[PDB]
Design a protein around this ligand. Structure first.
Ligand SMILES: [Ca+2]
Ligand SMILES: [Ca+2]
Ligand SMILES: [Ca+2]
Ligand SMILES: [Ca+2]
Ligand SMILES: [Ca+2]
Ligand SMILES: [Cl-]
Lengths: 366, 366, 366, 366, 366
């Protein structure tokens, strides 16, 4: 994921114009091979029109430039690009909200599954490893960067998510489908065993763990749904036709003709159609937005860092439920225990922009 | 469902242009009969204009080509296509999220309904079969591919979802409406019987089962709502008129006239209007997107695989609540039990793209 | 509601073109009186131009046809129609999801309110009648078809939703507002009485009934909100002006002039502007979409069948909580009790389209 | 709020054309002063062109009419109006769903807080008054019509929402911010006191009251968020510039020139540009839609009736939790106690439109 | 945040035209440097065309003005601006709803965590400080104005959110990632300690605190997701190219040529292209809307007041859970204890606009 949020914090003079010189995840990284092909077919059509095309067919070619330019319907391309791309960014953002994060589950495990002994932390470490295993098994199904890290189940056993004796349980289940759900059933069999032994003391404390797991698996179940049910291929191919057929009538219809032939609106030869290549940055570059986000789990520069989130949500959960269980600082009085205004002080930099009176509503004329 | 997600993982040079040669669920599979009819009425109008139409009516026909081309309002067709199709893909995706999946219910049944004996697994197998029966009864109402698998209720009894003695209970309920809800009431009468016998030990454990069933039936209730309440026929017929009346003024208005007659912008004869057929791929093909997703439960190639999800969610639930109930591997220490960094190792392929420092926020200039 | 979902299951050759011959809920049922008025003012303007208009004002009329056609801004009408109609279909679908359905409440009443005696079924029948009464009282406020069935409260008492002695309780509450909430307060006073008597055994079982009622009343409360807060009249009148003022400049600007006068683009007389009436099907018919869904509770053919849902959700709830309470078939083994694959068999028709290998993810190259 | 829902129940011949004669909340009530200014600057520019402008500058003025008409970009105004207004109607409807309604809380108070004595109804009346006070304190902050009813806190004490001794508690909290939250903390301190005294019998009954209050305050917290965080002023000023700069190039570019001067497309003098004023109804009237809904809590005719909802949700809650607590009619048998079909009868008017067979699904060919 | 809601309460004559003279957060504050550069390159191109450009290249320059004006595709810029900006305002508003507010948690802490002694208020003050610390640690990661207030963790310790002995616990956790979650795990370890000691009396009272914390942290977790996963840089650069390449063909294509040269539509010299600068307010100003909301946590005038919400939600929570715990006014009878109509009185200003009869539904013809 290309993060440029700190560059665009405040709207400056050169706000978005400094963004046109970046390379990682940019438009020029995706379109430098297509503009070489577009100039490769434009210069092959102009150098043949000046040199190869003879005079009887130079008149016929000029009858085709005025035919292709009038059919260059550049308006209706913007709606089959406009409505298709916002369908894509809607699915691209909903695929990130469906990423399996164990952060809502690591606060319930550390709050409900109790015990300071070896078995007490073994329950909290295995419950979070079962959540971490079920996120590895679904991300290695939908993302190429995780599958290159875990090509086999033995690469998951060697990584520490699965043990050697859980793989005998995992591989002896006669199921012809994907088995990312398996660790989520091991979560329920272990949370019901810890509830029976008294590790989970209350009854609502056990219900919250099974509530917060169905929020976590549905996230694993949605990633399998977005991977299987993509956008319709008939709807991807319409947008691909509409851009490339516009760029077929514009490859010929924007050819620079001979001025002395005597044709309307064709009186110059720029030697390079610079306001046509800038249409190729805008029309074809709008398609390359949706080419990058149609599968955000690949290995593009602006794709989702799925291997970052696996190592993060495996380390910060084992830190939270094993090393941070019931290890608190002792309770002392706050800095504003006797002050009726718990107002934190300011620095010198954020000091004179903070003199506005408090907004209390639109009707109170302050 | 046509899945092409692995082809479009990273944006390449020939990224979406390789998609224009696929056949299953494509645009050419849906439009090869219409372009034959469109060329069948274009070539019947051109071969009559050169040969059948005499000179007094060849002048009158040329007065009609310039009349139909100026009314070829290709711009306003893109908005009655643009706003109607995104209404359709919104309903097409919401009909997939309303698909009855028993995965959120198979984790509560294996966690709350207990017992290792024959009656203990008979409760878990009948509770999941009642969820699986209520998904069969609603999918055979809304989807053609399931109704060809279950034309009668006896085809559901022979398949194993309903027993022979439950059909006497199912068919003696004097109700003139659809009875997909029936197994969801059998779920509540069986979950309250297992709670009374002590199979469901806690009180919040019984409340979670009735909570997770109302999430499951509302999914069965939404599929009946999308099947009954389709998009308005007055709104389908406006889009169908607007495309086919544009293609009536474009069938005549884009005719290739005689150049020597002396008319503006009509100086050539391509013998095949290739930039008009490419408008037929884009305008009529945009309508065939919404023709395929207006009922996604049919038997198209890009329709929902409803019979896959019936056999999957009947097999993986009976595997989870009967064979996987309280059958865990024994608890042992993890690979990172003494390591303060639970960091899984990497392979050689995903090795040198993983050297970025960890993103901690936009304000920390790293 | 006009349901045509079975006709549009698979995209055929004549897929949407068979829809243009339907009559119920169609475009021709709504626009046959307006095209008679539109031709009534077009033919009154043409037959006066040939016969009534003399030569000094036939030149002045021709100066007005070329003035009205250049102001025929057919493009900006499509956006005040495009954005207004999708606001309308968004409210039209959200008014159907806010329809009071007692199906999520009939599963909690049959699962929590217990008792096989006369008082045990009287509690379940009165709790569901109080939900059914509160849906009648809100639908007779917002829908014309229910108010013609229940013009007075005595028509609700005679129908069986309210008793004769509940109407004395209903009509002696000194409230000047709508009283659809009243039965939802009778639900809470009866669910707390059954909980106190031991009919509702558990404490979470009583909390689920008050949870599922606030989901049900908010649905009754949303129908009162959509009925009171419609779309803004200033926003309805802008779209009505923009279509009818476009059809004023197009009623005169698309008049067929005399060819020998010598004017550009006016060289024919079709005797009937067929590509202008087809613009009246598309522009005015787009407005008649939003004319039908601005109040979907009327008595149009494509309006909501509110009287169907009253009789359905009153019959299937009394069937579920009175005749179906704790009346189950006895537990027996399933058809796949010893088989590790619970795979239901197929027919002969859905037999050879089911040979695809199971999709397990995009990265597994199968 | 202007409610016209009963007029638009069924799509008639004069369906939306009867709406163009209404006055309350209409387009003519908002635009009668602007069309007087628009004609005031059009007639001041035409009567100066015929009379004041001499012949050497009548030629220069005619060079400016053809310059302003070609820059009259009426297309791109419809998208900065189209996307801005649907952002506004999205916020205008979400501000109505965030209106603090005590109806979901009056059913939990009457169901959980018990007692028939004086203290038993004093708990239910004070808990609902604390919800009603917290809605008054947020609506008098965000709405002008409530602030004109409660300019001071003593106008709230005299109205009965706050007592004289609660104002000493309210005004001695040293907080410089808005204090609409205060009564919601008084709700929790009173619900925990009634739970301790045994007025709230169960433990889940107390959890539902604190659950349903956080749904109620977040509604009060969202109204403070929409009042403080409006739409961006840079995004309001772009739409205001784009309409008023289009109406500057159209004020001059649509001037009726002298026909004998010899200019293209300018051959008449209508003496009043009627298809330009109809563009002022459509373009400027689209802006006046968003001028009315940018703050829906003012005192327009189509604004939210906030003082209606204060008096309604203060009267129907005190009626529900004080006069309607545990005052039920006695349980008797329904009208369909022995009938297996609980089908309510029909009238004579809704009698022959009810003969359709019941829809059971798309696949059942009925 | 620039709040102007009180100015736009009612739609007046000069409603939005008074907004075009504001300066804070306006369009002129963001675009006064770009119109100086745009006039700086327009006047450098006109003063070179009159004076520097000689007659042989004054003819070649005039061949380029008519070439750049025909490629000035001002229509397709409005859709790559229209669909990109509403993606931005969707993320800008969802980043405000994901702001960590402790108001839903301060009502559960004051209602469940009990005790009037020193340890009883120390539990409520430390639980709310742990929520307030976790909002400081995520806002100093994503917002520049908070990071200038807390550049180090010692600036948070000196401010009072963290103690000196909690920083030893905070900095000895060997984690290479962001540690905003840490105080949310300290919340669970303290809420489970207070539940064990009997400070939290009930079991559902403890479950509500862990429920309302996962609502609060997911808000802290969403701010880290919006900061890391911005909009795609390929999609920001397409919109930046499309505006700046339109303003390259419009910088040259809208040049005022010499009238006597003899070119179509170029007959005047305004000496300042006022309807082109007004296109720069509309096209480039539409981009500066999305330049300000792409990171709403900076230090613009219309950015989010993040330091206001830190001091507010730290003061009003310590006021609610420490000074306002179980300190109620005594219960007395309301003003409408014997009146069956709890109708609050009106003033004189809001007196004669309140005579409408109560809306009870669309079907009741009142
Ligand atoms: Ca990708
Ligand atoms: Ca289909
Ligand atoms: Ca209707
Ligand atoms: Ca207003
Ligand atoms: Ca900013
Ligand atoms: Cl609960």
């Amino acid at each position: 994921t290309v993060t440029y949020t700190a560059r665009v914090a405040k709207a400056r003079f050169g706000g978005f114009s400094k963004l046109l010189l970046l390379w990682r995840g940019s438009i020029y990284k995706l379109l430098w091979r297509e503009l070489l092909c577009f100039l490769g077919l434009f210069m092959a059509l102009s150098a043949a029109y000046r040199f190869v095309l003879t005079e009887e067919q130079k008149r016929y070619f000029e009858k085709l430039v005025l035919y292709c330019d009038r059919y260059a319907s550049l308006i209706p391309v913007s709606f089959v690009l406009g409505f298709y791309v916002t369908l894509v960014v809607h699915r691209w953002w909903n695929q990130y909200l469906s990423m399996p994060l164990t952060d809502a589950l690591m606060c319930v495990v550390v709050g409900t599954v109790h015990g300071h002994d070896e078995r007490g932390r073994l329950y909290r470490r295995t419950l979070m490893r079962y959540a971490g295993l079920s996120g590895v098994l679904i991300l290695r199904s939908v993302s190429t960067a995780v599958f290159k890290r875990f090509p086999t189940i033995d690469h998951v056993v060697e990584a520490g998510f699965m043990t050697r004796e859980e793989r005998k349980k995992f591989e002896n289940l006669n199921s012809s489908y994907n088995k990312y759900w398996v660790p989520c059933v091991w979560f329920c069999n272990l949370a019901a065993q810890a509830r029976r032994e008294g590790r989970i003391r209350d009854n609502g404390a056990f219900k919250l763990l099974l509530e917060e797991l169905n929020v976590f698996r549905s996230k694993c179940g949605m990633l399998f749904h977005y991977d299987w049910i993509s956008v319709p291929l008939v709807y991807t191919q319409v947008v691909t036709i509409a851009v490339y057929s516009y760029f077929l009538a514009c490859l010929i219809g924007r050819q620079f003709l001979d001025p002395a032939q005597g044709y309307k609106d064709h009186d110059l030869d720029l030697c390079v159609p610079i306001f046509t290549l800038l249409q190729f940055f805008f029309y074809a570059g709008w398609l390359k937005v949706a080419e990058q986000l149609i599968n955000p789990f690949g290995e593009d520069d602006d794709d989702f860092e799925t291997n970052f989130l696996i190592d993060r949500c495996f380390q910060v959960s084992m830190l939270a439920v094993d090393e941070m269980y019931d290890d608190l600082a002792m309770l002392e009085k706050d800095l504003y225990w006797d002050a009726a205004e718990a107002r934190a002080p300011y620095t010198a930099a954020t000091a004179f922009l903070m003199q506005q009176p408090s907004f209390q509503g639109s009707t109170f004329d302050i």
